[PDB]
Design a protein around this ligand. Structure first.
Ligand SMILES: [Zn+2]
Length: 634
RNA sequence: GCGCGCGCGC
RNA sequence: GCGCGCGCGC
């Protein structure tokens, strides 16, 4: 892909120009236009421009590991013939290697930003002056408390409170600078100017002179929005909902306080949030004596899940599909395993089968949205018949529902659906597709194409039109500030930077006063006493452990199938409340400096005042202001 | 374990 | 800000 002798399009040269002039630039161009190659050009010119005797140093920031890897590879291959030493550092590297010496012995360093934040903090890397060029990938993240913005806080602290050493050139790559919570074009302009100030950029580089050349290869689908209406009378949903109430009551019979077993609140039937609730409930009940209870509970939650699925299918396909799904499920349950609970469940289902059948086959309960879909399909194909279509639905079951519905629609006899001899690809998640339809879907980021958005929800339409308006404000604002003289703009930016810096330095949180009184840490679920706060030690300023052998007998440990390591310790296992019927998630168990020690999260605990009985809940240790004692190998 | 960003609700 | 959820990082 990015590995063949790339020959530049004119727009890439145009984009590369201001950066090669030494200007701090935000390069803004669509996804897949070759901003990476542009960055290669800029890096090449930058390194090559130094007179013999001098040498530059370039750091490229990547936010995700895959990007880190792919650009490490690309950069390593591109500057092969040049002789430049190319390396990279990620959380998989450090802390295994001495970073300062790596940065010193290399010319092109690909980094995840948090590495650099860490090494600026610890002072291992003293100044950003060892770099002559910085490249930020996805530079629009340079805002708020993002690592990019921290690095740039270091940069700007060096620039404003002036400091002897030279600052590197800063380059940013993005496809959209964003507008934040802008409602007016002026607020958009202010936001964009703020982003430019955060990156110390004086130029926004967009394609202007070679726009035609760009648009000729950019996926810009014709956006179509179609608001559809849903059924007024749905008795199917009423019935299934009653079944689900029955099942949840049955579940509460074997698990009181099921209502406080998950943190997900105000669940509703036939939603993805309910699905998530099922997931968390099954999670918070892993399958001695408690395992039986959890197995029963598992059966109940499984059936609830099937019911939820069916409700969704009924919402977006036809009742027949939902009932068919349910019938396959219950047939399968009847087949491979007869249990008391299960047979009871299928039995409670079969007492409702006939009424469900009647509501299903009722032609007044048919789904109006499918008519709209059908008509869109007809209209699009009865024009261009060699049309290949991709259709996005929101569940795996809705795929099969839609497919069955298509293959059984006389008005759609010309279609051959698939999940070359396939006209329609129906799917859930993932350019050469000339027809895209988002049939009630939850995202179009990836030679005459259009995109349809079918939904019964008006808020989705609203959201989309809002997004488009924001796009327009963004582009207009960018043109506007591109008109300005660079010096005026630099003055403005400078004083924005001064303002922001002052705000940062002033709004430092005043150091908190700790209540040095000893308090109780109880299990949040079962309320059993886990420990006391005086046995608690802070590790690496952000992590919390408990001392003593007394605590070792208060938690059981289950081995982590994903033993990942960080720049501090290795997550070996997870820990739980040792009461053999609670088993609440308490945190993890780590290997830290050859020590095998527990690390706990305050969100799994209640803080009780000993003298009283006053309890308090904390989600973050940072908000729990008690006497925080440092850890010590003793 | 902690940190960062986004979405939804109040 | 709080709650919930998703995504990413050390
Ligand atoms: Zn417990």
């Amino acid at each position: 892909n990015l590995y063949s002798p790339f020959k530049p399009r004119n727009y890439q040269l145009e984009l590369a120009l201001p950066a090669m002039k030494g200007k701090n630039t935000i390069i803004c161009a669509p996804t897949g236009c070759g901003k990476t190659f542009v960055s290669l050009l800029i890096c090449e010119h930058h390194l090559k421009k130094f007179p013999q005797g001098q040498k530059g140093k370039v750091v490229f920031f990547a936010n995700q590991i895959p990007v880190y890897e792919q650009n490490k590879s690309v950069f390593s291959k591109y500057f092969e013939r040049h002789g430049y030493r190319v390396t990279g550092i990620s959380g998989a590297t450090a802390e295994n290697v001495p970073v300062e010496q790596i940065v010193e012995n290399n010319d092109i360093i690909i980094l995840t930003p948090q590495i650099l934040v860490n090494n600026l903090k610890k002072g291992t890397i003293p100044s950003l002056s060892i770099f002559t060029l910085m490249i930020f990938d996805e530079c629009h993240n340079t805002s708020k408390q993002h690592p990019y913005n921290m690095i740039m806080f270091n940069y700007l602290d060096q620039k404003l409170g002036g400091s002897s050493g030279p600052l590197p050139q800063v380059i940013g790559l993005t496809a959209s600078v964003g507008v934040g919570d802008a409602k007016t074009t002026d607020e958009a302009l202010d936001y964009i100017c703020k982003l430019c100030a955060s990156l110390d950029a004086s130029v926004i580089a967009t394609v202007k002179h070679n726009l035609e050349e760009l648009e000729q290869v950019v996926y810009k689908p014709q956006k179509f929005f179609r608001k559809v209406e849903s059924r007024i009378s749905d008795k199917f949903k009423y019935i299934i909902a009653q079944l689900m109430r029955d099942t949840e009551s049955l579940a509460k019979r074997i698990c009181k306080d099921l209502e406080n077993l998950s943190q997900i609140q105000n669940r509703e039937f036939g939603t993805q949030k309910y699905e998530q609730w099922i997931v968390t409930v099954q999670k918070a009940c892993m399958v001695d004596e408690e395992s039986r209870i959890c197995k029963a509970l598992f059966l109940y939650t499984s059936h609830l899940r099937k019911y939820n699925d069916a409700l969704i299918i009924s919402e977006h396909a036809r009742m027949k599909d939902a009932l068919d799904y349910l019938k396959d499920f219950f047939s399968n349950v009847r087949a491979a395993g007869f249990d008391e609970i299960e047979q009871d469940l299928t039995q409670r289902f079969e007492e409702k089968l006939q009424e469900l059948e009647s509501v299903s086959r009722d032609p007044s309960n048919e789904n109006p949205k499918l008519e709209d879909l059908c008509f869109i399909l007809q209209e699009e194909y009865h024009l261009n018949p060699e049309t290949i279509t991709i259709l996005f639905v929101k569940t795996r079951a809705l795929v099969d529902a839609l497919k069955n519905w298509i293959e059984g629609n006389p008005k759609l006899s010309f279609l051959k659906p698939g999940i070359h001899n396939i006209l329609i690809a129906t799917s859930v998640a993932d350019a050469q597709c000339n027809l895209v339809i988002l049939y009630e879907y939850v995202v179009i980021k990836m030679r005459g194409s259009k995109c349809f958005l079918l939904t019964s929800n008006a808020g989705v339409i609203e959201k989309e039109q809002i997004n488009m308006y924001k796009e327009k404000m963004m582009n207009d604002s960018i043109l506007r500030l591109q008109t300005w003289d660079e010096a005026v703009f630099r003055e403005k930016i400078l004083h924005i930077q001064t303002h922001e810096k002052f705000i940062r330095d002033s709004q430092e949180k005043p150091k908190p006063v700790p209540d040095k009184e000893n308090k109780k840490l109880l299990c949040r679920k079962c309320k059993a006493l886990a420990c006391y706060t005086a046995d608690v030690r802070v590790i690496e300023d952000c992590h919390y452990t408990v001392l003593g052998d007394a605590f070792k007998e208060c938690f059981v440990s289950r081995p982590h199938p994903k033993p990942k390591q960080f720049s501090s310790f290795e997550k070996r296992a997870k820990i739980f409340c040792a009461r053999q019927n609670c088993s609440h998630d308490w945190g993890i168990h780590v290997k830290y400096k050859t020590f095998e020690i527990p690390v706990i999260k305050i969100e799994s605990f209640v803080v009780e005042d000993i003298a009283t009985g006053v309890q308090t809940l904390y989600s973050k240790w940072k908000d729990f202001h008690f006497e925080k004692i440092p850890f010590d190998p003793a």
